[PDB]
Amino acid sequence: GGLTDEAALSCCSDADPSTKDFLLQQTMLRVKDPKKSLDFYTRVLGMTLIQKCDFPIMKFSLYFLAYEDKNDIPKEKDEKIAWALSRKATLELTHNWGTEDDETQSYHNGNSDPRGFGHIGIAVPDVYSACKRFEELGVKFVKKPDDGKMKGLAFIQDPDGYWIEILNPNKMATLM
Amino acid sequence: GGLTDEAALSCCSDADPSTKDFLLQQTMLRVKDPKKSLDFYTRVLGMTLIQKCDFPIMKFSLYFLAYEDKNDIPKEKDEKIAWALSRKATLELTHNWGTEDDETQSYHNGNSDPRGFGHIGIAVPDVYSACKRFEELGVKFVKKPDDGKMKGLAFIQDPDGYWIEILNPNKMATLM
Numbered sequence: 001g002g003l004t005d006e007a008a009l010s011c012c013s014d015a016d017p018s019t020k021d022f023l024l025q026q027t028m029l030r031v032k033d034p035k036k037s038l039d040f041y042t043r044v045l046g047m048t049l050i051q052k053c054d055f056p057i058m059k060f061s062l063y064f065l066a067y068e069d070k071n072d073i074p075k076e077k078d079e080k081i082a083w084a085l086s087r088k089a090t091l092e093l094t095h096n097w098g099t100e101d102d103e104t105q106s107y108h109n110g111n112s113d114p115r116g117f118g119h120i121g122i123a124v125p126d127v128y129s130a131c132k133r134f135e136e137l138g139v140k141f142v143k144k145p146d147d148g149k150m151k152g153l154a155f156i157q158d159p160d161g162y163w164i165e166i167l168n169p170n171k172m173a174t175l176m
Numbered sequence: 177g178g179l180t181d182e183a184a185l186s187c188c189s190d191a192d193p194s195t196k197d198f199l200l201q202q203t204m205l206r207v208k209d210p211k212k213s214l215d216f217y218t219r220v221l222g223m224t225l226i227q228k229c230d231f232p233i234m235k236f237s238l239y240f241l242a243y244e245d246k247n248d249i250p251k252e253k254d255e256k257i258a259w260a261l262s263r264k265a266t267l268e269l270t271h272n273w274g275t276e277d278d279e280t281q282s283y284h285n286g287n288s289d290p291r292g293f294g295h296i297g298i299a300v301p302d303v304y305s306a307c308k309r310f311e312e313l314g315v316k317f318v319k320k321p322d323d324g325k326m327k328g329l330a331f332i333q334d335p336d337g338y339w340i341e342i343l344n345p346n347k348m349a350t351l352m
């Protein structure tokens with residue numbers, strides 16, 4: 001019912017040289033409360049806050065989180081922004097000021113109508129021991145690693161209810 | 177209205193050693209028509225299809241796209257999946273079989289109510305020359321690099337209407 005390999009590959013062009021050193025730099029999610037999100041992404045998931053930008057006239061902040069050594073963060077503001085925004089695989093969290101106070105407000109995780117965005121995913125060396133730690137930290141699960149057909153694979157949720165896949169690259173081969 | 181830098185840093189914990197091997201492996205978007213998506217991400221954006229997975233009983237396919245040399249893709253199926261799913265900064269496109277035929281169906285890009293997910297972002301060497309090429313390829317723009325206050329920064333849309341930021345890490349410093 002899907003594409004054959006031939007049909008999919010036929011729609012794939014070789015990369016034009018004008019796209020050399022293009023990189024997938026960021027995924028942007030809106031967060032209700034940056035205090036809860038920064039705590040979750042740093043303390044639970046082990047990411048580093050590499051850059052914060054505030055736009056007072058437009059009333060929002062941007063928070064860039066990445067799996068980066070905090071010692072590699074430049075100290076010069078100009079160099080720091082250029083370094084942060086040239087890292088692969090960053091998470092950009094957008095804070096619209098006031099949402100944290102608004103009892104009525106929440107963001108949509110794209111896993112109920114209307115769907116689109118599904119999840120971010122973290123590759124971990126040990127899914128079961130990562131999930132044991134998540135459980136002990138009181139993390140909310142969508143899919144415990146032992147539930148359903150796909151054993152050794154988990155989904156958790158962040159403070160806004162965004163889904164985070166927890167996967168082990170070797171266990172994914174075997175699940176085929 | 178937002179956090180001070182000190183208040184943001186106050187909410188950040190240092191990385192637990194159990195998280196030091198973790199990497200931000202994927203961002204998952206649902207795509208209506210994988211033929212249009214594969215063409216756009218490979219031919220326009222220069223990504224490589226590194227893995228295709230078909231789940232007949234669940235009626236979906238997964239397409240993993242990444243800025244990777246096609247010569248680095250292992251040929252052994254087991255090695256290929258372990259390699260693909262251990263790459264940083266991949267895009268996972270989910271094809272729910274039949275959506276391409278369904279006149280009634282489309283995915284939500286998260287940038288109108290209900291909001292959450294905002295965009296993926298590509299770092300390029302030269303935003304103006306990247307965008308000149310995008311225009312000549314017929315790409316739909318949300319924001320041309322010279323439109324609005326934020327000059328030197330662009331948003332395009334993919335075939336499902338997902339927003340893709342086109343940014344240059346150095347031009348972002350100056351926009352502060």
Ligand SMILES: [Zn+2]
Binds near residue numbers: 092
């Ligand atoms: Zn962005």
Ligand SMILES: [Zn+2]
Binds near residue numbers: 121
């Ligand atoms: Zn996934």
